[PDB]
Design a protein around this ligand. Structure first.
Ligand code: NA
Length: 121
């Protein structure tokens, strides 16, 4: 149907907007602390601590399969990156501190992307 094609164009356009959001968020992580999944070789107990791991590569895979239906879903995954790190790592670590910074600096990027998704429908 033509209705299905239009829904598809909307998903594609959301995907394009989210790809740019994701590059912008990831520049707020120059150290590449959240670039890839936590290694289970190197942190074998990780899953006893954190039930839903997230990272930017896993988000990028989901994105390119147009697996985000809206901004809220995308925000949930971003927030898992931060919230996971702040539980697993203590306050006085480079890892926790990099989450706080990614959070604060990501907040601005997301505040405008919410306006762009409402605005552009
Ligand atoms: Na903790």
């Amino acid at each position: 149907s033509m209705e299905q094609v239009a829904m598809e164009l909307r998903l594609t356009e959301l995907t394009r907007l989210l790809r740019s959001v994701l590059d912008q968020l990831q520049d707020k992580d120059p150290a590449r602390i959240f670039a890839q999944p936590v290694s289970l070789k190197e942190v074998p107990d990780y899953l006893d601590h954190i039930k839903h791991p997230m990272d930017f590569a896993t988000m990028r895979k989901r994105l390119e399969a147009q697996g985000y239906k809206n901004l809220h879903e995308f925000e949930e995954d971003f927030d898992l990156i931060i919230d996971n790190c702040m539980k697993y790592n203590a306050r006085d670590t480079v890892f926790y501190r990099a989450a706080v910074r990614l959070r604060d600096q990501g907040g601005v990027v997301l505040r405008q992307a919410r306006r762009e998704v409402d605005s552009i429908g």
